[PDB]
C-alpha cells in the first residue's frame, strides 16, 4: 500500500545515490560494498540483468516495488528448495539429519552463522528430533 511505497522510496534513496530513479550496476555494487559484503562486478551484472524486466542494465522503481512485493508463494520455488534438500538426503528416506545439516551448511557455499543455523533448527526442528523432513520445511517456508 501507500506506506509500503514510501518505504520503497526510502530504500531507493538509500540505493540510488545519483537520483536518476534507476539503481545502476555500479551503484548497486558500491552500495552493497557499503552494506558489509564484497561481491564482483560480473556477478552483479549477471544477477541483475535477468532480474531487470526491460533489460536496461539497471532496475527502475516499478520493477523494484514489484519484486519487493513479489511473495515467495508466487515464485513457486517449493520444488527447487525440496530438490536442494533432496540432494543431501543420500539415503533417500525422506528425512535429513540435523547435526549433518549444521556441519554441511557451516562448510557449504555462503557459510551461515552459528546463530543462523540455530534459528533454522528453532523454526524447522519443531519436532526437536534432529532428523527433520524437508518436504514439511518447504511447505511451511512457502506458506
Amino acid at each position: 500500500t501507500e506506506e509500503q511505497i514510501a518505504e520503497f522510496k526510502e530504500a531507493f534513496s538509500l540505493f540510488d545515490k545519483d537520483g536518476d530513479g534507476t539503481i545502476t550496476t555500479k551503484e548497486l555494487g558500491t552500495v552493497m560494498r557499503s552494506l558489509g559484503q564484497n561481491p564482483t562486478e560480473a556477478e552483479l551484472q549477471d544477477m541483475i540483468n535477468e532480474v531487470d524486466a526491460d533489460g536496461n542494465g539497471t532496475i527502475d522503481f516499478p520493477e523494484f516495488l514489484t519484486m519487493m512485493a513479489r511473495k515467495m508463494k508466487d515464485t513457486d520455488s517449493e520444488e527447487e528448495i525440496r530438490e536442494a534438500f533432496r540432494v543431501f538426503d543420500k539415503d533417500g528416506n525422506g528425512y535429513i539429519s540435523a547435526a549433518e545439516l549444521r556441519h554441511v551448511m557451516t562448510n557449504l557455499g555462503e557459510k551461515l552463522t552459528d546463530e543462523e543455523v540455530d534459528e533454522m533448527i528453532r523454526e524447522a526442528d519443531i519436532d526437536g528430533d534432529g532428523q527433520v523432513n524437508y518436504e514439511e520445511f518447504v511447505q511451511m517456508m512457502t506458506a
Binding site: 538509500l14 519484486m67 517456508m141
Partner: protein, 353 residues
C-alpha cells in the same frame, strides 16, 4: 603486503599444484623443457652428433636443474597455506606423501651425481619423467579400468595365452627340424608372441606348409584375442571418465543446493513485517536500512534459485528420470490425499441427504 602476499602464495599453490588452463600451460612448458633435455641426451648418446648435442645440452640441463630447484623451493614455500600443512612443521609434514618421497629421492640422486654415470642419468631421467603426474590420476584411471573390466580382460588373457602356447607348440612340432628359426620351443614361443601381437619382425616365420597352415589358423584366432585387451581398455577408459564427469556434475549440483537452502532460510528470517528474526537481522548488521537488507536477501534468494536450476540440468537420462520420479511420488501422494478427501465427502454425503 600481507593479504597480497597470501593471495600470491595461494595463486602459486594453484599453479604449482593441480594446474588449470594457464597453470597447465606452464606445466606443459616445463614438461617440454625436460623432454627436450631427454631428447638431447638421446642425441648425445650417438657418436656422430655427440659434440653438438652435448654443446647444446649443457645449457639446457643447467636451465632444467635451476628450474627444478626454484620449483621445489616454491612448492615447499606454498605448502604452508593449507591448514593441514600450516607452519614450517606442517610444511615438513607435507613431504611424507609418496610423491614428495619420490621427488626427494630423485633430488638426492641428482645431487649425488652432480657432486658409468650415463646409466644412472638415464634412470634419473625416467624417474623425473614419472614425477610429472603428481596426482596418480593416470595410474588410478588405469587401475580402476582394469579392475572394473577384470572379467573381460582375464578371459582375453586366458584364451590368448592358451592360443599362444598351443600355436607355438604346434608350429614348433611342424618345424623343429625343417626350419632353423624354430630349433627350440623358446624360439617358437617368441615367434608366437611376435605373431599374435601382429608385430611380425620377420626374424622367425614358418616355412613348412603344415607349419604355415597351423600358423594361419592360430594367428587368426590369436590376433583377434590379443587385439581384444586394447579395445576393452579403451571402452573402460571412456566409461570411467564418463562416470567421473557425472560425479563432478553432481557435486557441482550439491554446492548450489546448499547455497539455495542458505539464502531461502535467510529470506524466511529476514521478512520485514515478521519478527523474532534477530539472528539473521543481527547477522546482516554485523556483516555491515532494514528494507535494504530485505531487498538484498530477496535478490540473493533469486540468484541462488537461478544457480540451483542451472545446476539441475539433466546431463543424463537417469538423472531426469530420478528428478521427475520424485515428483511422480509426490503426485501419487497428492492423488491419495484426494482419494481420502473424496472418501470424507462421500461419508458426509449421507449427512446432507
Amino acid at each position: 603486503r600481507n593479504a597480497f602476499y597470501r593471495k600470491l602464495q595461494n595463486f602459486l599453490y594453484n599453479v604449482l599444484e593441480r594446474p588449470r588452463g594457464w597453470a597447465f600451460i606452464y606445466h606443459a612448458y616445463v614438461f617440454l623443457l625436460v623432454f627436450s633435455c631427454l631428447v638431447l641426451s638421446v642425441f648425445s648418446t650417438i657418436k656422430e652428433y655427440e659434440k653438438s648435442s652435448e654443446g647444446a645440452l649443457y645449457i639446457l640441463e643447467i636451465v632444467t636443474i635451476v628450474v627444478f630447484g626454484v620449483e621445489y623451493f616454491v612448492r615447499i614455500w606454498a605448502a604452508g597455506c593449507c591448514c593441514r600443512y600450516r607452519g614450517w612443521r606442517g610444511r615438513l609434514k607435507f613431504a611424507r606423501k609418496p610423491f614428495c618421497v619420490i621427488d626427494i629421492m630423485v633430488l638426492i640422486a641428482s645431487i649425488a651425481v652432480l657432486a658409468s654415470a650415463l646409466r644412472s642419468l638415464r634412470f634419473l631421467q625416467i624417474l623425473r619423467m614419472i614425477r610429472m603426474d603428481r596426482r596418480g590420476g593416470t595410474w588410478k584411471l588405469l587401475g580402476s579400468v582394469v579392475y572394473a573390466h577384470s572379467k573381460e580382460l582375464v578371459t582375453a588373457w586366458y584364451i590368448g595365452f592358451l592360443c599362444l602356447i598351443l600355436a607355438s607348440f604346434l608350429v614348433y612340432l611342424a618345424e623343429k627340424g625343417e626350419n632353423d628359426h624354430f630349433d627350440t620351443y623358446a624360439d617358437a614361443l617368441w615367434w608366437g608372441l611376435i605373431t599374435l601381437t601382429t608385430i611380425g619382425y620377420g626374424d622367425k616365420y614358418p616355412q613348412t606348409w603344415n607349419g604355415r597352415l597351423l600358423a594361419a589358423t592360430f594367428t587368426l584366432i590369436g590376433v583377434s584375442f590379443f587385439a581384444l585387451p586394447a579395445g576393452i581398455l579403451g571402452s573402460g577408459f571412456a566409461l570411467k571418465v564418463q562416470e567421473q564427469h557425472r560425479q563432478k556434475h553432481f557435486e557441482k549440483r550439491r554446492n548450489p543446493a546448499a547455497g539455495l537452502i542458505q539464502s531461502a532460510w535467510r529470506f524466511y528470517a529476514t521478512n520485514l513485517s515478521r519478527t523474532d528474526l534477530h539472528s539473521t537481522w543481527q547477522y546482516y548488521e554485523r556483516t555491515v536500512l532494514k528494507v535494504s537488507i530485505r531487498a538484498v536477501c530477496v535478490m540473493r534468494f533469486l540468484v541462488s534459485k537461478r544457480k540451483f536450476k542451472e545446476s539441475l540440468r539433466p546431463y543424463d537420462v537417469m538423472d531426469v528420470i530420478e528428478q521427475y520420479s520424485a515428483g511422480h511420488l509426490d503426485m501419487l501422494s497428492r492423488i491419495k490425499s484426494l482419494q481420502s478427501r473424496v472418501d470424507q465427502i462421500v461419508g458426509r454425503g449421507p449427512a446432507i441427504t
